[PDB]
Design an enzyme around this catalytic site. Sequence first.
Site, PDB file in Angstrom:
ATOM      1  N   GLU A  35       0.819  -1.218   0.000  1.00  0.00           N
ATOM      2  CA  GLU A  35       0.000   0.000   0.000  1.00  0.00           C
ATOM      3  C   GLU A  35       0.853   1.268   0.000  1.00  0.00           C
ATOM      4  O   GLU A  35       0.608   2.213  -0.782  1.00  0.00           O
ATOM      5  CB  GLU A  35      -0.922   0.071   1.250  1.00  0.00           C
ATOM      6  CG  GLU A  35      -2.259   0.823   1.084  1.00  0.00           C
ATOM      7  CD  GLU A  35      -3.254   0.184   0.046  1.00  0.00           C
ATOM      8  OE1 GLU A  35      -3.092   0.752  -1.034  1.00  0.00           O
ATOM      9  OE2 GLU A  35      -4.003  -0.694   0.352  1.00  0.00           O
ATOM     10  N   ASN A  46      -6.730   9.796  -6.261  1.00  0.00           N
ATOM     11  CA  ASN A  46      -7.595   8.830  -6.952  1.00  0.00           C
ATOM     12  C   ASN A  46      -8.188   9.881  -7.892  1.00  0.00           C
ATOM     13  O   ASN A  46      -7.952  11.098  -7.727  1.00  0.00           O
ATOM     14  CB  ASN A  46      -8.527   8.148  -5.929  1.00  0.00           C
ATOM     15  CG  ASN A  46      -7.742   7.470  -4.835  1.00  0.00           C
ATOM     16  OD1 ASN A  46      -7.529   8.230  -3.691  1.00  0.00           O
ATOM     17  ND2 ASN A  46      -7.253   6.358  -4.915  1.00  0.00           N
ATOM     18  N   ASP A  48     -11.412  10.716  -8.264  1.00  0.00           N
ATOM     19  CA  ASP A  48     -12.687  11.264  -7.783  1.00  0.00           C
ATOM     20  C   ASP A  48     -12.440  12.450  -6.852  1.00  0.00           C
ATOM     21  O   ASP A  48     -13.381  12.991  -6.230  1.00  0.00           O
ATOM     22  CB  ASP A  48     -13.478  10.162  -7.048  1.00  0.00           C
ATOM     23  CG  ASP A  48     -12.836   9.807  -5.732  1.00  0.00           C
ATOM     24  OD1 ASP A  48     -11.447   9.798  -5.727  1.00  0.00           O
ATOM     25  OD2 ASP A  48     -13.441   9.483  -4.726  1.00  0.00           O
ATOM     26  N   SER A  50     -10.558  12.547  -4.241  1.00  0.00           N
ATOM     27  CA  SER A  50     -10.072  11.994  -2.972  1.00  0.00           C
ATOM     28  C   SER A  50      -8.578  11.687  -3.080  1.00  0.00           C
ATOM     29  O   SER A  50      -8.023  11.558  -4.192  1.00  0.00           O
ATOM     30  CB  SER A  50     -10.824  10.728  -2.625  1.00  0.00           C
ATOM     31  OG  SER A  50     -10.042   9.560  -2.857  1.00  0.00           O
ATOM     32  N   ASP A  52      -5.351   9.478  -0.788  1.00  0.00           N
ATOM     33  CA  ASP A  52      -5.057   8.392   0.154  1.00  0.00           C
ATOM     34  C   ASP A  52      -3.842   8.834   0.968  1.00  0.00           C
ATOM     35  O   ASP A  52      -2.867   9.394   0.422  1.00  0.00           O
ATOM     36  CB  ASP A  52      -4.795   7.086  -0.626  1.00  0.00           C
ATOM     37  CG  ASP A  52      -6.079   6.478  -1.126  1.00  0.00           C
ATOM     38  OD1 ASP A  52      -7.181   6.985  -1.011  1.00  0.00           O
ATOM     39  OD2 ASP A  52      -5.964   5.444  -1.724  1.00  0.00           O
ATOM     40  N   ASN A  59      -8.440   6.798   3.092  1.00  0.00           N
ATOM     41  CA  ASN A  59      -9.107   7.755   2.198  1.00  0.00           C
ATOM     42  C   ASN A  59      -9.751   8.963   2.881  1.00  0.00           C
ATOM     43  O   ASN A  59     -10.250   8.868   4.022  1.00  0.00           O
ATOM     44  CB  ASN A  59     -10.209   7.031   1.396  1.00  0.00           C
ATOM     45  CG  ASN A  59     -10.522   7.757   0.114  1.00  0.00           C
ATOM     46  OD1 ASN A  59     -11.772   8.360   0.058  1.00  0.00           O
ATOM     47  ND2 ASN A  59      -9.792   7.796  -0.861  1.00  0.00           N
TER      48      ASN A  59
END
Length: 129
Positions: A35, A46, A48, A50, A52, A59
């Site tokens: 990750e 990402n 959209d 958002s 991380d 998120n």
Amino acid sequence: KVFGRCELAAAMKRHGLDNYRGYSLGNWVCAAKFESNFNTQATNRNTDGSTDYGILQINSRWWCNDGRTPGSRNLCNIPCSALLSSDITASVNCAKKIVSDGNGMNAWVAWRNRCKGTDVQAWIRGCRL
């Protein structure tokens, strides 16, 4: 901070995660490796809007606020930035919430595709735990 395999294991353990909701310690070291590469300062956008954050890539559309994701529910009640600190306390604390809601560690794309159903104990092989 960029954690060592062993060192993170030890720390996640210290922090109540070995078998939390029934996931072996290894399930956690594994997810974190793939990750964020044990790097707490990691971030990723990402599509959209958002982003991380941290070792466990939590998120911002749901768990934490970073002040530029609109849909945003801050269920963890922490600024995203908090999740990037060298102390993983905030990230664990929040990760506990994520994993308990309903989908287990499926909530983590990478665990599901690269960790799930592999011998995850191999991640804590060698460790004083």
